[PDB]
Amino acid sequence: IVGGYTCGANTVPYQVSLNSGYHFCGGSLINSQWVVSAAHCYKSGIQVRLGEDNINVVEGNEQFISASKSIVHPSYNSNTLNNDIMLIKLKSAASLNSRVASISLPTSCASAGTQCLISGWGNTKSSGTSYPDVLKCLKAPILSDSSCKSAYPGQITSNMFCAGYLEGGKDSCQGDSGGPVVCSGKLQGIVSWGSGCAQKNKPGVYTKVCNYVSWIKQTIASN
Template structure:
């Protein structure tokens, strides 16, 4: 790699960082909505990072040092601006999940992790309806570090998206969909379905929510949160909560799922009780996360899977 090539990469890096800074001076209000600009910047920043990572291994010693400085600059600047503007796009206040401890966790991948999902069988994945794509996406199973090969992964293309017929994109009611895989997954200790609920979760149930977020971190994050009462949920979001939604989290704020976790699992006592759906900001006081109430959809899920 010659000096002119390195200079062009440096100019491109700084130009993209400037564009990201300018865009994310405007904050995002609801975690469920994404603009095309947001998505394109996410993809561009990750693509450029990957280019820099490849170039790091192909130059002389001086160029390698320069590339590494650019790579760290890219990570530092994009992490700061994505996080500050979006109240972070990943689980807030959580911890790194023990490796492969959430074998039902799925990543919906389109150049980056744009939504989560939940493995229900060797052929079916559950997610949020607002995560539906107009084109096929890569469904990633058995992942822990989303950007590093670990010999546990299975990457399978989607074959069909089936959102619930009552899904309302304005209110996010019935925000749930099934994804049929293009081929069956191999079930093992790294890739294993979660059980559907035998009954609805009661207030106070302790649950686990997990996800990667859109931008960072690379490794799967976990958070232990309680299910809140219906009254608390309704009072947190007056006239916005339906009977098909539950709230989970802490009213004092500081811990919550977020944008990039949409479609991911809320599991209580080994059963899937919620799908990450929406909320105001992330981890804000008196604004807990809102989840699709899976126990209301067990019949639809089973019927759809059986007829598929």
């Protein structure tokens, strides 16, 4: 997260870290046994880390649970990042409390102008590299589809939306991928891609979760 603020320990209780010996992507807990992330975060041998603030210090509220199954969206295209969404089933159910909690799926899509909360342990610099150890937060609005398509000609599908600031300076970044975009208490987006980070006229692009609720629900019901 570039240009954000320190969230505070366990104030984003649905935020997960995906760990393969190191943090490499975020994710969102959507019930006690399932995490949603970005398909471009796929790899084998994922441990899901819940209840994290400092990802380098054991602080006492963590739950570490290995993945038993990963399901990349059937139509994920790694060249265009269309359908950049994946489900991860935990080997055992998480213990839910005030610091580890699920986030609700949306029943409707959010409109441009809605303010959302984006969070992650990704890079905090637009030119250098500096990775934080504690969770960072950013409040950002959903942008109109017209401004999104004007910023990224020929690249925005109906399964994507832009959020952020056309002026630059505030954005998600590398290492935030897979993490949540939460608006009015519902998971509306997944950190997916962008050109650089926090560049002028290059806002962040997010997977539009409301298009996938039927697939998520049917997949969880049968796996």
